[PDB]
Every structure is written in structure tokens, then in C-alpha cells.
From a paper:
At the [name] N terminus is an endonuclease domain (ED) that is responsible for [name] nicking and ligation, in the center of [name] is an oligomerization domain (OD) responsible for hexamerization, and at the C terminus is an ATPase domain (AD) responsible for [name]/dsDNA interaction and translocation.
To understand the architecture of Reps from CRESS-DNA viruses and how they interact with dsDNA and [name] to unwind dsDNA, we determined the structure of PCV2b [name] bound to [name] and dsDNA using cryo-electron microscopy (cryo-EM) to 3.8-Å and 4.4-Å resolution, respectively. The 3′-to-5′ orientation refined to a cross correlation (CC) of 0.64 with a Clashscore of 0.0, and the 5′-to-3′ orientation refined to a CC of 0.5 with a Clashscore of 4.4. The better quality of fit for the 3′-to-5′ orientation independently agrees with the biochemical data demonstrating [name] to exhibit 3′-to-5′ helicase activity. While the density describing the sugar-phosphate backbone of the [name] is strong and convincing, the density describing the bases of the nucleic acid is smeared, likely due to conformational and sequence heterogeneity within the data set, and therefore, the modeled poly(dT) is a generalized interpretation of the multiple [name] sequences bound to [name]. The phosphates from [name] interact with amino acids located in two loops: pore loop 1 located between β2 and α2 (Trp202) and pore loop 2 (also known as the “presensor 1 β-hairpin”) located between α3 and β4 (Lys240 and Gly241). Density for the [name] extends toward the center of the OD ring and terminates near the guanidium group of Arg148, suggesting that [name] is translocated through the pore. In total, there are seven direct interactions between [name] and ADP in the AB interface, three in the BC interface, two in the CD and DE interface, and no nucleotide present in the EF or FA interfaces.
Residue numbers in the entry:
A (entry chain A), B (entry chain B), C (entry chain C), D (entry chain D), E (entry chain E), F (entry chain F): 119 to 301
Amino acid sequence: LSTAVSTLLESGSLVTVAEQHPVTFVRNFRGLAELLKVSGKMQKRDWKTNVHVIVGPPGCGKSKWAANFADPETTYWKPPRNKWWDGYHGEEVVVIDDFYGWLPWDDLLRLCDRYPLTVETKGGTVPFLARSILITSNQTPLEWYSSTAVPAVEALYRRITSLVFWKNATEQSTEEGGQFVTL
Amino acid sequence: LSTAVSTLLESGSLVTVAEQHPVTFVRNFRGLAELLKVSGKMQKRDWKTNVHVIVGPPGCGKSKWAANFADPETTYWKPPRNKWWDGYHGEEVVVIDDFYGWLPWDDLLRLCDRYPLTVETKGGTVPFLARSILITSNQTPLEWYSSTAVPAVEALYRRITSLVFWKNATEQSTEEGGQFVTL
Amino acid sequence: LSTAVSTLLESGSLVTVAEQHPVTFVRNFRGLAELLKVSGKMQKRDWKTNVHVIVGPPGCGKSKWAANFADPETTYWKPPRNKWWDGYHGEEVVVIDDFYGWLPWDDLLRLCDRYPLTVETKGGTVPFLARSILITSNQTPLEWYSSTAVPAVEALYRRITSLVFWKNATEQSTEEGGQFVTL
Amino acid sequence: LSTAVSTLLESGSLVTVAEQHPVTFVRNFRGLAELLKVSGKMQKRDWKTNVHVIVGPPGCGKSKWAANFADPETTYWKPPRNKWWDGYHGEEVVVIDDFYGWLPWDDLLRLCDRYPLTVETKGGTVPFLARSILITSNQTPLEWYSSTAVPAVEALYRRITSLVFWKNATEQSTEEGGQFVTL
Amino acid sequence: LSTAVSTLLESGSLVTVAEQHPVTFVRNFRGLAELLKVSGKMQKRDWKTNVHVIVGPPGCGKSKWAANFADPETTYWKPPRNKWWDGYHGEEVVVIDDFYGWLPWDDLLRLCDRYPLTVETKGGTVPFLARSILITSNQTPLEWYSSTAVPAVEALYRRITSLVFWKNATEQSTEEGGQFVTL
Amino acid sequence: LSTAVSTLLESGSLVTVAEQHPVTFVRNFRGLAELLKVSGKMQKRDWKTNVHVIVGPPGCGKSKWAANFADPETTYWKPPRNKWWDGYHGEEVVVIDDFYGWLPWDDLLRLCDRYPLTVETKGGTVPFLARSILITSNQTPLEWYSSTAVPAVEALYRRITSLVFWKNATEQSTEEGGQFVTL
DNA sequence: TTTTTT
Ligand SMILES: Nc1ncnc2c1ncn2[C@@H]1O[C@H](COP(=O)(O)OP(=O)(O)O)[C@@H](O)[C@H]1O
Ligand SMILES: Nc1ncnc2c1ncn2[C@@H]1O[C@H](COP(=O)(O)OP(=O)(O)O)[C@@H](O)[C@H]1O
Ligand SMILES: Nc1ncnc2c1ncn2[C@@H]1O[C@H](COP(=O)(O)OP(=O)(O)O)[C@@H](O)[C@H]1O
Ligand SMILES: Nc1ncnc2c1ncn2[C@@H]1O[C@H](COP(=O)(O)OP(=O)(O)O)[C@@H](O)[C@H]1O
Ligand SMILES: [Mg+2]
Ligand SMILES: [Mg+2]
Ligand SMILES: [Mg+2]
Ligand SMILES: [Mg+2]
């Protein structure tokens, strides 16, 4: 356990302690996470996270493309209508699926901002090291959060990387331009 | 417990650990489960979950067909009226009984899909992997939800794999999908 | 403990362990309940919970008969009006007392079915295993729930086993479902 | 520990253990609680709880009589306008202070009844074991509740054991039977 | 921790246990809370609370004399317009600031009585043991509540131990208390 | 160990405890947190909070000026149009944006006073320690309320420190404050 | 954490 802290407080936690020291992590699993969170070494983030937004009527393979995006080993699916990010003890595809506006708008913005973040799970907090958020929906992206219920709708628009609509029941087409309020 | 951790590392199932070495699994059960979560060898889902829907007036014998279907030992009779799936911890009949829509719409769509999902318990989250869901009702699925308060109701009918009915005081005659609505 | 776990895995009931060696159940009590949940030997229900309904104006001795139906060591008196089956860790008799309709309709339909059920306790889940639900009321089962606001009022009546009624200020006489809407 | 388990399982609730071997109750406290709840010997109430109402205009030394009815070690003064019984853990005499009608009717009946009951606390449940409910009030029991919203007001008066009143005299005089409805 | 228990059962305050024993409170911090809560001996109010109503038009240092009452540290400041006494943790001075009547009339009649009470906090209840309730206001105690809405009605104007007005922009003159209804 | 408490009682911060002695912070972390939360008095406030009102015609670069008052990383941007200061931890710029009269009058008068206050989130309370409140509005502070509904009625302007205005497309001019009702 | 709380 003396060596356990030494390995823990280098980088890349807790995945590498659990890989390297399996026995000592069966015990103290709450405490290693608390020590790491207390110190300023939770592997923070400085990269603008990519946001891909998909729109199309159901049955048009919205989520199929999200599944076929990166390796399934390194993919997380946000369970909807639930503000708990349990299961994020790996990382870095995050596919919030089948959206209808069920997240607090400010937090949704915070996930799409550039600053570091720490989401909360059942039994502590976990750093949010995302690189591509595939926000998959079925409706127009504007309607998710009403303009009266939001201080500024354009703030959400600013951090979108790319957007995809659906064509006349044949093709997935990429939306390019200012058909709606652009960024 | 080093043997127990190694025999968890490759098998990746707490059920096996509890079968082999109960004593260690009794003393440190949060630790083993969290180690399994962090090491990434969890059990995601990549298969379509069949949704057999039974409809009939009460007393006709809907639920006895669910209670005899797969095995008395591998069916999880879902606790009703609430979003808690406690005690589930693996496997693969999930029988939501006596349903009339008392589950959130988006979550009911998400239970009946091919892509992964973590489901919520009193203490944390247990991954969802169901090879077949049996839904028992008194109304037809056309009126489980408000057809106006739901954006696109075709996205539920598209997931049901078989809609079994009750005919005029004779038997449970399986209906054929795609006739009255999609299936 | 090494023997206590052995008893637990094959008795299938934490009550047994709690009575044999309490001292090794005072410690490691979460562990045993989680081994029992994982191993699958947690006890389900597959029998029919025969439901007795008692009616009569107040003070006529409804509750006394309910306390004289089984040993007080086993009768679990349901807490009123608040849908929390706390204090239940089993055994046969359940006396929901002084009933007037303070339970959701589907829960009253589903307690009395023959198939497994899990009830909520205050921060957990308890499996339901009763063999007799003595409902005690001042009103006939008609006046528990309004007919219009109920999918089918005949569903509850099918599950009532016996109906004892107080008449003519002498003594309560068992009914046979003739005058009442029969079962 | 087996001494603590002796004093617990043989007879009583956690209070007796707390009074006998505190150093064995600062440790193992959650597990003694679960052993008690699973053993089944958690003290029910099988007796009749006397109900002494006190009526008098504000300032007549109403509550002085209640605080002098029994030793302050065994008086639980219920907080007002709540359904919560927090902190109770068994306190023989229960003085509902200045009670103008802020408790549900059937719940007030069940407190004054003579058969088991488990009252609710913030995040748990506690078995009711009172023996003398002193209902200090301002009006006669005929003004606590209205006959419109009540099945039958006699159903409460049947349980008021004694009834002290204040009239135009410095003494408090008991009520011999009922000039109003009989108790 | 033998000394810690004997010190806790006498002083009845966890803060004292921590200060007189840091090391053995870092471990067994939950157990000491449960031992205190179950054993009894919790410090309950058995004295009279000394109400000091401070009244005058705004800007005259109503709050200045409120915080002047020693100490600046041991003075709970009641949250405005609210029900929950959150975080109170045991003080001796309670300064309800800038009152209008927001606390229910009966709750204010009960805060100033001479008997134990249990206030509500968001997640539990905390015993209320206060020796002076500085009710800063802007009106006299006559017009805090409507003349007819109060049913008692002379039960607040009994317990007002002190009173201070503010005269014509000169100084805070202690009201003699005789002109109004007596205190 | 023992020296952890020695280094905690002379720091007042857990961060240094983790830095110098992490090995005994991986264990016992819950108890150091409770010890700090129970031995150190909650942080009150005694400092007049500056209230810089920003007013102008809509869209005049008000929000950028608001963020430019101090560091955005320690700036709140209170969720508008409700009464839940979702913690935010104490963050000592407070920018209430687009205020147009929706907080209660006395609550706003209290938020800008020299004496402690505790705003409430959902499921708890957070101490309110703000060195600056930035009320960004649309129209004059006298139109936020009418003098009929507000029986103070000029008590807010004492609390306003300064005023920032936008003249006819020149700049965000800082108000004299000497023409209108004084500051 | 869930419960409570909203
Ligand atoms: N192995 C497979 N075989 C056949 N079809 C597949 C397979 N995997 C994915 N699909 C198709 O992917 C589509 C996913 O679309 P959909 O279920 O509408 O997404 P969502 O429900 O998230 O909007 C389905 O129409 C399904 O037919
Ligand atoms: N002991 C028995 N004897 C005869 N029939 C029975 C018995 N137990 C159950 N049944 C039948 O089994 C069927 C299924 O029971 P149940 O699942 O409670 O009804 P439902 O199908 O309406 O949910 C009912 O139609 C009932 O008549
Ligand atoms: N041990 C006993 N000895 C004598 N009489 C008893 C005993 N237990 C109960 N009783 C009688 O039984 C009756 C039960 O009353 P109660 O439970 O209020 O009826 P209900 O709950 O049906 O209205 C009481 O009136 C009481 O006189
Ligand atoms: N410990 C005590 N010492 C002195 N007097 C007391 C004590 N306890 C109660 N009293 C007296 O009892 C009376 C109780 O009055 P109060 O509680 O206001 O009315 P009620 O009891 O009708 O609510 C007071 O006038 C007080 O003088
Ligand atoms: Mg979808
Ligand atoms: Mg059924
Ligand atoms: Mg009864
Ligand atoms: Mg009183």
C-alpha cells in the first residue's frame, strides 16, 4: 500500500493502479480515488471536446452510426434521464443517445466547453476526459432547450463541431451552412 | 485473495467468484465489483433484445405464460411502478409484468435496443444485458402512452418482435405484425 | 464465518444464518446478503398468497381476529399509508390493517398474484414471500376503488380467498360470494 | 460481542445494548440493527396505549402537567405538523403538544389503537411502543376534526382513556364519563 | 475508545468528544453518532427561551444590535422565509432577522415555550436548545399577523421577554412594556 | 496515524494533509472530513457586499462586462427565475443576470447586507459569502418593483454601491449616482 | 446512497 500511493500519484489513475496492483485495489478503492481527487493530479483536460449532433426520424440508423464511430472498447453510453455518470471508469467516446432535452442546459454546455470537468458518479467523482460527444437525437437540435428557459441559446450553438440531418428516407447527409441559427 | 482476483481478471464475472471462493467474496464485495468496473472487462450488450408482448383481459392467463417461459431460475420479475432494478445481477429474461406504460418512454425505447445500457439500482448501477423481454398488459400497446404527448410513437412498435393476443375466450392466438401498425 | 457462509449458500435464507450463529452475522451482514443475491439462491415466490378480507364497522374486533390468525412471531403488520415495506425480512402472514384504498391499485392486484415480487424498503429491496394477506377494512371491497378509474374491477375479486363480514351486532359470519360480486 | 448479542437477541432493542456494553455498540452498530430486524424479536406493541387528553385556554399550565407526568428520560415530545417521529428509539410516554388537528385521522386512530405499528422517521422506520399518549390541546376533541371529512367521530372518542379539563377554577378537574359523547 | 464513550455519555456533544479526543474520533465517528442518538442523554431544552423583539423602521441598525449580542460566533441566523433550521448544530442565540410572520404562528408560539422541541433540517431533525431568540423586525409584535387570522390570540405577547423600539432618529429606547398588552 | 491529526489541527485544510501524509489519508479519509466539518465553525460573513448594477438597452455587451468584473472561474451566473442557488461552494463573484423583479423584495435586501445569510440548493443549504453581486438588468432599478407592493420603500438604493449605464452608443458609462436617488 | 425534497 506504501508503493500503491507511489504508483497512484504519477498519472493515469485509477486504471493503472488497478492494472498493476490488483490486490491492493480490492481494498482501499474508495480511498485511492479520494486521495487522487484531493491532489491536483486528476489527469485534467485542455482540448475542446468534439460535439457531433445527429437528427433524423426513428428507424433511420441514427444510433447505428454512433455505434460504428470508434472502438466499442473505449466507448461510453450515457444512460438517459439520469444525471449520474456511473460507468465512466474508462473513457472517451461519450454518446448521449436519443436526446430530448433531459440534461440541465448549463451542464450540457459544460460538457461541450474546453475547461476541465469532473462529473459525479455513485460513490464519488470521475474526471470527464471526453474527445467526441455524439449527441444523437430525433428532432431539430434547437428545440431541446426553450429560449425562455435558457439565458442564451447561441451559447450551445458555439461549441458544436459538426451536425447531421437526414435525407428523403435514403441517405445520411451532412448539414453545411446557416439553415438555422449558426455558430 | 490473490487467487480470487486472478480468477476474476479473466472470467470477469462475480458470479464465478462467488461460486468458487465465497468467503473472500463475502468480506470484500464492493472491492471486487469496483475492480471489475475499472479494469474495463464489464459485460456490454451488442444484441437485439426480443420483446414479446402479451395482451389479454385479466384472468385469461397472460402471466402464466411468462412464468413458465424460459426457466424459473433465470427470470427477473421487474419490481413495478419504479425505476429500480435492484438485486438483478445477471441474466436475460426480464419480465416486466402487468404493464400499462408506467415506465418512462425514452427508457422503454432504450431497454428494447441493441446498444449498451447501464440500469440503476439502490447502491449503484448493474449493466443491462437481456436476451428477451416479456411485457404483459391488459390494453394493446397502442394506448400504453399518450399518442400526442410522445414525439414519434412508431419507434416503440418497430422494436416489438412478437405481439401475442387473446382471442374470443379460446386461446392465445399469435397476431402477425405489420398489419395494423409496424413491427 | 467459513461455516456460516456454507449454511447461507444452501439454506437460501438469511434468517437461518441470523439464528444459527448471530455473532458472525453481526459482522459481515452486507457480505452475506450480497453473496445470496449473486449466487441466485435468493428465495422467490411461486405459490398462491391466499387473501382474507374482513369487513365490519369499527370496534367490532376486526383487528383482534387478525392478531389471532397466526403467531405474533410471524405476523408483519404493514405500516400504514406509506408504501414502504420496512421491517419485513419474511415470514408468512401480512395483515394490512384498517384498509380504505391507500395502496396503488396495481400493487394490490400484484401482491396477491402467484408470481415473484420485490417490495421497497427504506434504502433497499426485500423479496415478498407471504402466504396470507389479511386485509382489514370497514368498507366492502367495492368502496376501496372507484369503478370508472380502475381498468377492471374483477381482477382484485379473483384473488380474494375468503370474505368475513360482521352482521346484526352479534358475530361475524363468513360469506360465499353470492350477494357480493362473485369471485 | 457475544455478550452484546446475548443482551440483544434474548430480549429488547438496541437501547438496552447501548445501556449495557457501549464500547461494543460504538462498533458493529449497523450489524446489531440488522441482526435485530432479521431475528424477528424486534419489540412489537401488543398492549393498550392510554390516551389522556388535556384541554384548557392558553396559559393554564397545560404543558406543565405533561412535563410532570413522567420522568424526562422517558418522554418523547413529538415535533409538530410532521409525519416524522425522528429520534424516538422507544420512549414510553409520548406527549403530542398543542394538537389542533395536524395529524391524519386514521393515523391518530392507529397511534391510540392497541396493536402493532411502525412509525416513520427520516430515512428509516422505528417500532412504536408507547404506553401513554398525552394529547395536550386547546379545544375539546369535538373541534379537532370535522364530521364531514371523517367516517365516524366516535371511532376516536372510544380510545380517550381519561380527559382532564379546565373550567373557571384554578384546579384541573377530570371528566367523569361524558357530558358530551362517551369515551 | 473507552474514554471517548464515557466522555460522550456525560457531556452529550460530539464536538466536545472530538476536541477532547481527536484520534479516536477520526475512527468510529459514525458509531459515536449512533450511540448518542440511541442511548438518550441528548441535550434537550428544559429552560425558558428569552425572546428579545427588536423593532424599528429600516436602516436604523436593527441587525447591528442583532449581531452585537455576544458572540459573533455562537449566533445561528435563521434562513429567511423558510422552514428548515439547517446546519444549526447547537447554538445558544438564534437571531430571526427581518421578520414579517413567515414562521407559522404555532411554530413561533412553540419556539418560545419552556419544553423540548425538535426543529427540521433538510435530511433530519436537530434538537433546538436556545436561550434567547432575537426577533428583529420592522413592525411591533401587534401587526406581525392579522388580527382575525390568529385564533388564540394572546400567547405570543406573553413570552416576549424584552422589547426595544426606535424613536425619532435619536436612539434605541427600551420599551417600558406597560403601554401595550403585558409581557 | 496520530501525526495526521497533528498536521490537520495546525493546517485547517485537507489538501496539505493529503500532500504530506497521503498513506494515512488513503485510509481514514471520511473521518478527517467529519472532524474538520465538526470542529471548525461554519464560515459566517460580516462584509458589505458590493452591488454593481448594470443597466442598459438590450444586447449592449452587458454579459461580457459581467464576466470581465473578475475571474470567470470563480463567478457563479446564478440560475435565473428560481430560488435555488445550486452550490457552487461559495464563489464570491455573484452575477444575477437579466434580473427584472423576480426575487422576493426582502430576500434581495438580505442578499446585499453586512450580516450572514444561507441560500438553499435542492437537498441542502450552502453558506452565502459574496464579496460582489453584479445585478445585470434591462431597465431602471425603480421599475423592478412598485412602491405599493414594497413597504420599505427606498431601502435598496442604500445597498447599491455604484451603477453602470450604456449611453447612446458611446460606451458602458459608469454612473455619477448624484442625479437620481443616491447610492 | 436513498431518502428526502420539490
Ligand atoms: N446486425 C444488424 N442487423 C440488421 N440491422 C442492424 C444491425 N445492427 C444495426 N442494425 C440497424 O440499425 C438501425 C438502428 O436504428 P434505430 O434503432 O432507429 O436507432 P435509435 O433507436 O437509436 O434511433 C436499425 O434500423 C437496425 O435495423
Ligand atoms: N390452483 C389453481 N387451480 C386452477 N387454476 C389456477 C390455479 N392457480 C392459477 N390458476 C389459473 O392460472 C391463471 C393465471 O393466474 P394469474 O397469473 O394470477 O392470472 P393473470 O393471468 O390474469 O395474471 C388464472 O387464469 C388462474 O385461473
Ligand atoms: N387481552 C385481552 N383481554 C380482554 N379483552 C381484550 C384483550 N385483547 C383485546 N380485547 C378486546 O378486544 C377488542 C379489540 O378492539 P379493536 O382492536 O379496537 O377492534 P377493531 O380494531 O376491529 O376496531 C377490545 O374492545 C378489547 O376489549
Ligand atoms: N422549571 C420551572 N421553574 C419555574 N416555573 C416553571 C417551571 N416550569 C414551569 N413553570 C411555570 O409553569 C407555567 C407554564 O406556563 P405555559 O407553559 O406558558 O402555559 P401552558 O403550560 O398552559 O402552555 C409558567 O407560568 C411557569 O412559571
Ligand atoms: Mg434511439
Ligand atoms: Mg400477471
Ligand atoms: Mg384495526
Ligand atoms: Mg403548550
